[PDB]
């Protein structure tokens, strides 16, 4: 324990605090607590807003600086996914700061990790299945954001992007936001079609398990008949499907619920 | 508009495309400032006033309070602003330019639209806010005047920043050092 509250310090005062904001990053992962302490604490959000809202006018292409906010950010992947500290860090409007970030199109090493580590926030945010948390992130660019992040970049985040968007997907109000329109519609199949295409992974079984889920809807399952991937009824995948049990199964009912 | 626009060369300095120039940008900004100030302002006074309540919990000298309130609402109004005008303002300010070398000029001025959208994001905020910390403000009024000696506060929750430790918490009065945290930035 206390070498945290030392560290703690630091990061609302003490001059070094990026070395603090490296190590407290690092024991994140452990105690099961210091969520709940990284919020009741004082100084500790306020602080640690400072450090995302520092990077803004870096925004316009970095180097170390991304590193240093980007321990701010597993700070506040930490924080989310708590379920003390999850709907207080969400109700507070905190996550909204991370979205200019999910902007950039920059494809430097630097920005791919901004982005990469500020995803895992959201993606944490979802982790646990609370329905509040979707109507608030529907409130927002953050889908058409995702799918923008699914098609291009890396396959790391390209992997929580598809998982963040399964996520909505699953809840009743996220897919009748998506599959509100065809508009809406058609920006998602589009572009699971494009990965299909673009093609072990675990983007292939995130892929089925949307699409799994976009047959539920009757209004997609008949459009999904004729805009289905034909990659995924031939045998081409189910090479690589054979250690999925889950997917497998996922696959093959999707099928099953394709046609009649 | 005012300052002629300085400093630059073309756009600015040739009169007949001056006037075309400074259209662009008043449309650029009329464009997009209903819709930037409604939503930035209202990400500002919601996440500042769950953030100061929580730690100001056992704060009195509403004073204090307010000037901790207002410049970390106000920074973080303009902060957001800057942040999500940049990107369309400009994408519109061409738009709008073609229709009717080009980033080198904008780039140069785009200073002034930038400062009114702050401006008012920043005001409309300290607005919102002030209204919304009217119960907070008030109900330590009362615990004022009518109880003096007294503790202060524990409104709702404060059940694990009941914690001993050192001044990572909640005490009494807020110290010179946590109340100099959000004095500065």
């Given at each position: 324990?206390?070498?945290?509250?030392?560290?703690?310090?630091?990061?609302?005062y003490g001059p070094q605090?990026?070395?603090?904001?490296?190590?407290?990053?690092?024991?994140?992962?452990?105690?099961?607590?210091?969520?709940?302490?990284?919020?009741?604490s004082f100084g500790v959000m306020t602080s640690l807003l400072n450090e995302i809202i520092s990077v803004y006018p870096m925004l316009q292409p970095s180097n170390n600086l991304s590193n240093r906010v980007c321990n701010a950010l597993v700070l506040l992947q930490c924080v989310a996914s708590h379920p003390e500290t999850k709907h207080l860090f969400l109700q507070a409007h905190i996550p909204l700061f991370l979205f200019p970030f999910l902007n950039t199109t920059s494809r430097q090493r630097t920005f791919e990790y901004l982005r990469l580590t500020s995803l895992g926030?959201?993606?944490?945010?979802?982790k646990?299945?609370?329905q509040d948390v979707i109507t608030f992130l529907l409130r927002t660019d953050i889908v058409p954001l995702c799918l923008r992040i699914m098609e291009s970049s890396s396959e790391l985040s390209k992997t929580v992007a598809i998982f963040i968007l399964q996520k909505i997907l699953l809840d009743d109000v996220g897919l009748q936001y998506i599959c509100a329109t065809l508009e809406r519609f058609y920006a998602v199949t589009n572009v699971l079609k494009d990965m299909v295409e673009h093609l072990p992974g675990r983007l292939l079984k995130h892929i089925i398990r949307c699409y799994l889920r976009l047959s539920d809807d009757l209004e997609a399952r008949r459009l999904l008949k004729i805009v289905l991937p034909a990659k995924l009824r031939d045998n081409t995948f189910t090479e690589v499907l054979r250690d999925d049990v889950g997917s497998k199964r996922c696959l093959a009912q999707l099928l099953l619920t394709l046609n009649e | 508009p005012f300052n002629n626009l300085l400093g630059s060369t073309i756009f600015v300095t040739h009169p007949d495309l001056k006037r075309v120039f400074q259209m662009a940008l008043a449309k650029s900004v009329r464009e997009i400032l209903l819709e930037v100030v409604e939503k930035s302002s209202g990400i500002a006074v919601v996440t500042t006033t769950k953030i100061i309540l929580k730690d100001f919990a056992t704060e009195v000298d509403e004073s204090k309070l307010k000037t901790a309130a207002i410049i970390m609402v106000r920074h973080l109004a303009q902060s957001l602003a800057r942040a999500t005008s940049i990107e369309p303002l400009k994408e519109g300010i061409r738009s709008t330019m073609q229709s009717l070398e080009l980033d080198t000029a904008i780039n140069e001025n785009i200073g002034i639209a930038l400062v009114l959208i702050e401006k008012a994001s920043?005001?409309?905020?300290?607005?919102?806010?002030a209204d919304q910390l009217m119960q907070a403000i008030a109900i330590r009024r009362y615990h004022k005047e009518r109880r003096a000696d007294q503790?202060?506060?524990?409104?709702?929750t404060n059940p694990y920043s009941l914690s001993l430790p050192e001044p990572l918490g909640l005490k009494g009065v807020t110290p010179q050092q946590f109340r100099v945290y959000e004095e500065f930035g």
């Open positions: 324990d206390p070498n945290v509250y030392h560290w703690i310090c630091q990061l609302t605090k990026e070395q603090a904001l490296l190590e407290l990053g690092r024991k994140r992962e452990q105690f099961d607590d210091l969520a709940v302490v990284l919020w009741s926030v959201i993606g944490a945010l979802v646990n299945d609370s | 920043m005001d409309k905020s300290t607005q919102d806010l503790p202060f506060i524990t409104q709702n």
